């Protein structure tokens, strides 16, 4: 049952990572947080653009 379990968990992790879920863990692969606020320098974004007609 140990081997049966790690087969399902390997499929569950791959499926969970495939979904577009909100970030649950604090830190991603790096030590940095996975929030929208975690945008530091370098500054490379221009002014926000308006709506299109």
């Amino acid at each position: 049952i140990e081997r049966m379990t790690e087969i399902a968990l390997h499929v569950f992790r791959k499926a969970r990572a495939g979904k577009v879920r909100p970030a649950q863990d604090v830190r991603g692969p790096d030590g940095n947080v996975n929030d929208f606020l975690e945008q530091r320098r370098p500054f490379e974004h221009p002014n926000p653009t308006g709506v299109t007609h």
Binding site: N47, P48, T49, G50
Partner: protein, 62 residues
Amino acid sequence: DFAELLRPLRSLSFNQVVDRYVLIPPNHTFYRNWTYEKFLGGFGLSYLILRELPLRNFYARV
């Protein structure tokens, strides 16, 4: 033009002038300061509508 300032006085007699412009019946019940309240209070009401401008940039609304 100096004679135009006295136009409404020529059609009237003196007793009619006093009863018209001098002897206004006392009525101290009106809200006279509503003129200032609507004008100055409009700054606050204008801010309610102005704070919802769809301007995309935050510094443009600054």
